[PDB]
C-alpha cells in the first residue's frame, strides 16, 4: 500500500482551517488509518487513530475523516503550535507511511535575495574549492537552484541547506554549495547560479569570473 | 511521557548497533521500531509481539535486524543508509490481528536515538570567509559569512561578534558530504555602507575536537 | 500449542476488545462446524464442564496456522456428550461479537444456547467476562454432578 499526501506544503495564517489529504493507492479495507505530527526536532505524537477517532489528550480542534482510498485530517482553527509536519499512517496491512505535509505560516510572496561567493584563497591553498550561492529571505519555501560552470549545467556535485521558517518575518533561506576540485576550478572562468522562484518574473542569475 | 532509549552511537560500516527501550504498571502488546533518516519521513523497521513470540520485518531490514525483549533492537551489516533516528513504540490496543500478528496505532513513543554510520573520526573544522563585494542585490544590502567545512562529528556552533550580531544571521543546517565529513555555512546580511567601517567576526566552536576559531570576514 | 488459537481479529469499530486477550457500561444455531477465519480468540465448548477447542481440519487433525487457512475449522459436533445431555459452545467473531451455538430451549427449565445451563446461571470459564461482560457481578457456585456417568466439577455464575 502507498499513501500519498497532498499538498506537500500547506500555507495558512493563525486561526484559519487546515485540511490535509491522505490518498491510498489501494483501499484500506476496514479503515485502519492514523495521523501523526512531528515538530522540528521531536518525536512523533499520535493525533488521530482509526480514521475518525481522536487520541487521548489531543485537543478537540484536531479531526479526522475519510474512508476507502481518500482520508483527511482537519485542524479547525490553527494555533501557533500546530505549524509542523503531519504524517498519515496505515496499519491495515504491513505498516506504511506517507510523506509528510508541511504546514507553515502564510505571507506575501517574497523573491529571494541572491548572492554568489567564490572560494576563498585560503581554501584554494588547502587544495579544495567550494562555490556558495545564497538564497536569502524568500517565500514560499519552494525554490530551484541551477549551477553553471562555463555554461555547463552542473548536476550531482552540489548540496542544499534550508533554514527553518523565521519566527519574525516567516521567510525561508537557502544555501547551495558547489564542490569543485582546485584543479577543475582553475580550468574554468565563468561561474553562474540561476535561481527560479515564484516571486521572480524571470530566473535571476548571479555570476562571477575568476579574478 | 516518552519512553527511555539507549544513547546515541556512532558505528563504522559493517558494525552492529543495539538500542534499548525502557518501559515506565504498564500495558503493551508488541514492540515496534520506526526510523527516520535525516531529512526524510518515517520508515517502519520490524515489529515483534512478545505474547506470541512472532515478529515481522521490512524487505530492506529483513536480512540484518531482530527485535527481542525492556525491549531491544539490533542492526547488523550497517551501511551509510542506516544513518537515522530510531524510535521504539509500545502501542497499547491492537486493532487488526491475522495470525500471528496484531496491528494497531502507534501509541507510546520513545525519546529516539541517533545512529550515525560513518568511518570518519573526530576532526576540527576549517573556517573560510564568504567575503562581501560590490553586489548589493536589494536596497544596498551585503551578504557575508563563514564556511565551516570538513568537521566531524556533529555539532558545530557559530555566532557573530560574540553574540552582538544576531539580526540578519542565517546559520544553515549541517550537510553530510560525500567524504563522510560535515559542512556548514553561516551568513549574515549587513548594510552596504558599513563594510569598511564595521568589523564582522564569526565565532566557530566545535567542542568534540575542541576547536575554537574567530574568522574576521572582510571584503575583497 | 499457542498456534491452535484462531486470531482473525478485525476490530473495525475501534472498541479495543482485542486488548484483554493480551491482558462495561452498556450492560439458536446448531453446534456443527464453524470456519476459523471468522473466529477471534479461544473457543469454549460447554459440556457439563468447560473445554477448550483448538483449530483443526475437517478430519480432526490439529492445525497450527492460527486459523488463517480456509481449511481451518472447529469441530464443535465432536465435543457433544454421547448420552445426549445439554450442550453449547461460545466464541468471539472477528468484530468483537459474542457468538453462541446450542440446542433450542425446550422450556424455561431447559438450558440456553451458550454456557447458559439456566436462564439465570452461566458456566464459569477463563474467558467468561470477555465474552460476557454483563456477568461480572454474578455469584459463583461450585457444582458437582454426574452427567452420563462422568463426574463434572465446575462453577456457575448466577444473579
Ligand atoms: C460478527 O457478529 C455480528 C453479530 O451481530 C455480525 O453482525 C451482523 O451482520 C449481519 C450481516 O448480514 C447483519 O445483518 C446484522 O445486522 C449484524 N448484527 C449486528 C448486531 O450488527 C457480523 O456480521 C459478524 N461478522 C462476520 C464476519 O460474520
Ligand atoms: C478483516 O480485515 C481485512 C483487512 O482489513 C479484510 O481484508 C477482511 O475482509 C476483514 N474481514 C472480513 C470478514 O471482512
Ligand atoms: C506456528 O506459528 C509460527 C509463527 O507464525 C510459525 O513459525 C510456525 O511454523 C507455526 N507452526 C508450528 C508448528 O509452530
Ligand atoms: C457491577 O457492579 C459494579 C460496581 O461494583 C458496577 O460498576 C457495574 O456497572 C455493575 N455491572 C452491571 C452489569 O450491573
Handedness of CA C64, C66, C69, C72 (dihedral sign): positive
The architecture of the domain spanning A108-210 is Sandwich (2.60)
Domain A1-107 class, CATH top level: mainly beta
The answer to whether the CB of A74 falls within 8 A of the CB of A17 is: yes
d(CA C101, CA C76): 9
Q: CB of A50 within 8 Å of any CB in chain C?
A: yes
User: A49 and C14: CB-CB below 8 Å?
Assistant: yes
Alpha-carbon distance values, A211 to B5, B75, B220, C45 (Å): 54, 51, 11, 92
d(CA A179, CA A157): 6
Task: Tell me the domain boundaries of chain A.
Answer: 1-107, 108-210
The answer to whether the CB of C80 falls within 8 A of the CB of C33 is: no
The answer to whether the CB of A80 falls within 8 A of the CB of A24 is: no
Cα(C97) to centroid of ligand 1, in Å?
Answer: 8
Contacts of C39 in chain B (CB under 8 A): none
The superfamily in CATH containing domain B120-220 is Immunoglobulins (2.60.40.10)
Cis geometry, peptide bond prior to residue B53 (ω within 30 degrees of 0) = no
Total number of residues shown for chain C: 159
The answer to whether the CB of B156 falls within 8 A of the CB of B206 is: yes
The answer to whether the CB of A208 falls within 8 A of the CB of A150 is: no
Task: Tell me the domain boundaries of chain B.
Answer: 1-119, 120-220
d(CA C157, CA C142): 9
- For this entry, resolution in Å reads 2.8
The answer to whether the CB of C29 falls within 8 A of the CB of C79 is: no
In angstroms and rounded to an integer, the radius of gyration of the C-alpha atoms of chain B is 23
Q: How was this structure determined?
A: X-ray
**Closest-CA residue in chain B for C16?**
B93
The answer to whether the CB of C33 falls within 8 A of the CB of C73 is: yes
Q: Write out the H or E segment, with its range, that includes residue A122.
A: helix A121-126
d(CA B76, CA B64): 5
Cell of B157: 556552533
Residue A184: Cβ within 10 Å count: 12
Instruction: Write a three-state SS string for A31-85.
Output: CCEEEEEECCCCCCEEEEECCCEECCCCCCCEEEEEECCEEEEEECCCCHHHCCE
Q: CB of C7 within 8 Å of any CB in chain B?
A: yes
Pocket test of ligand 2: the residue of C7, C9, C10, C96 to mutate, having most ligand atoms within 8 Å of its CB, is C10
Alpha-carbon distance values, A165 to A84, A169, A198, B195 (Å): 11, 8, 17, 28
User: A95 and B44: CB-CB below 8 Å?
Assistant: yes
Cα(B89) to centroid of ligand 3, in Å?
Answer: 25
Amino acid at each position: 500500500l502507498t499513501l500519498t499526501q497532498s499538498p506537500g506544503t500547506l500555507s495558512l495564517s493563525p486561526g484559519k482551517r487546515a485540511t490535509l489529504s491522505c490518498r491510498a493507492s489501494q483501499s484500506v479495507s476496514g479503515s485502519y488509518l492514523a495521523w501523526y505530527q512531528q515538530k522540528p526536532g521531536q518525536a512523533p505524537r499520535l493525533l488521530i487513530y482509526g480514521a475518525s477517532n481522536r487520541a487521548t489528550g489531543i485537543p478537540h480542534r484536531f479531526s479526522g475523516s475519510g474512508s476507502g482510498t481518500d482520508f483527511t485530517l482537519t485542524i479547525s482553527r490553527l494555533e501557533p503550535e500546530d505549524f509542523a509536519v503531519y504524517y498519515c499512517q496505515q496499519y491495515g496491512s504491513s505498516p506504511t507511511f506517507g510523506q509528510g505535509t508541511r504546514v507553515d505560516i502564510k505571507r506575501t510572496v517574497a523573491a529571494p535575495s541572491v548572492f554568489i561567493f567564490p572560494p576563498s584563497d585560503e581554501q584554494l591553498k588547502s587544495g579544495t574549492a567550494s562555490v556558495v550561492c545564497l538564497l536569502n529571505n524568500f517565500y514560499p519555501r519552494e525554490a530551484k537552484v541551477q549551477w553553471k560552470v562555463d555554461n555547463a549545467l552542473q548536476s550531482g556535485n552540489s548540496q542544499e541547506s534550508v533554514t527553518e521558517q523565521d519566527s519574525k518575518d516567516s521567510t525561508y533561506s537557502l544555501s547551495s554549495t558547489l564542490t569543485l576540485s582546485k584543479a577543475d576550478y582553475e580550468k574554468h572562468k565563468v561561474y553562474a547560479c540561476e535561481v527560479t522562484h515564484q516571486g521572480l518574473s524571470s530566473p535571476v542569475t548571479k555570476s562571477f569570473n575568476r579574478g | 511521557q516518552l519512553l527511555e532509549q539507549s544513547g546515541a552511537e556512532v558505528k563504522t560500516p559493517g558494525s552492529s548497533v543495539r538500542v534499548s527501550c525502557r518501559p515506565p504498571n504498564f500495558n503493551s502488546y508488541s514492540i515496534n521500531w520506526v526510523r527516520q533518516a535525516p531529512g526524510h519521513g518515517l520508515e517502519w523497521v520490524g515489529t515483534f509481539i512478545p505474547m506470541f513470540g512472532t515478529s515481522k520485518y521490512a524487505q530492506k531490514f529483513q536480512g540484518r535486524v531482530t527485535i527481542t525483549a525492556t525491549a531491544y533492537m539490533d542492526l547488523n551489516s550497517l551501511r551509510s543508509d542506516d544513518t537515522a533516528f530510531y524510535y521504539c513504540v509500545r502501542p497499547e490496543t491492537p486493532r487488526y490481528c491475522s495470525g500471528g500478528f496484531c496491528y494497531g496505532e502507534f501509541d507510546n513513543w520513545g525519546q529516539g536515538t541517533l545512529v550515525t554510520v560513518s568511518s570518519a573520526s573526530t576532526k576540527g573544522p576549517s573556517v573560510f570567509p564568504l567575503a562581501p563585494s560590490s553586489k548589493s542585490t536589494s536596497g544596498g544590502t551585503a551578504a557575508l559569512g563563514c564556511l565551516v567545512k570538513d568537521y566531524f562529528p556533529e555539532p558545530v556552533t557559530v555566532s557573530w561578534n560574540s553574540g552582538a550580531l544576531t539580526s540578519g544571521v542565517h546559520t544553515f543546517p549541517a550537510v553530510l558530504q560525500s567524504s563522510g565529513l560535515y559542512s556548514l555555512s553561516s551568513v549574515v546580511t549587513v548594510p552596504s555602507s558599513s563594510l569598511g567601517t564595521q568589523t564582522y567576526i564569526c565565532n566557530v566552536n566545535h567542542k568534540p575536537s575542541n576547536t575554537k576559531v574567530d574568522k574576521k570576514v572582510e571584503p575583497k | 500449542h499457542i498456534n491452535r488459537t484462531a486470531l482473525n481479529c478485525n476490530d473495525s469499530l475501534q472498541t479495543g476488545f482485542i486488548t484483554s486477550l493480551f491482558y462495561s457500561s452498556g450492560c439458536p444455531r446448531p453446534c456443527d462446524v464453524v470456519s476459523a477465519r471468522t473466529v477471534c480468540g479461544p473457543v469454549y465448548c460447554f459440556t457439563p464442564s468447560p473445554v477448550v477447542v483448538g483449530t483443526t481440519d475437517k478430519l480432526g487433525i490439529p492445525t497450527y496456522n492460527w486459523g488463517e487457512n480456509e481449511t481451518d475449522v472447529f469441530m464443535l459436533e465432536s465435543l457433544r456428550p454421547p448420552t445426549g445431555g445439554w450442550f453449547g459452545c461460545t466464541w468471539m467473531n472477528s468484530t468483537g461479537f459474542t457468538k453462541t451455538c446450542g440446542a433450542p430451549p425446550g422450556g424455561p427449565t431447559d438450558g440456553g444456547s451458550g454456557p447458559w445451563i439456566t436462564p439465570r446461571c452461566l458456566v464459569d470459564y477463563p474467558y467468561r467476562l470477555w465474552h460476557y461482560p454483563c456477568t461480572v457481578n454474578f455469584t459463583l457456585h461450585k457444582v458437582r454432578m454426574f452427567v452420563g456417568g462422568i463426574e463434572h466439577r465446575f462453577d456457575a455464575a448466577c444473579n
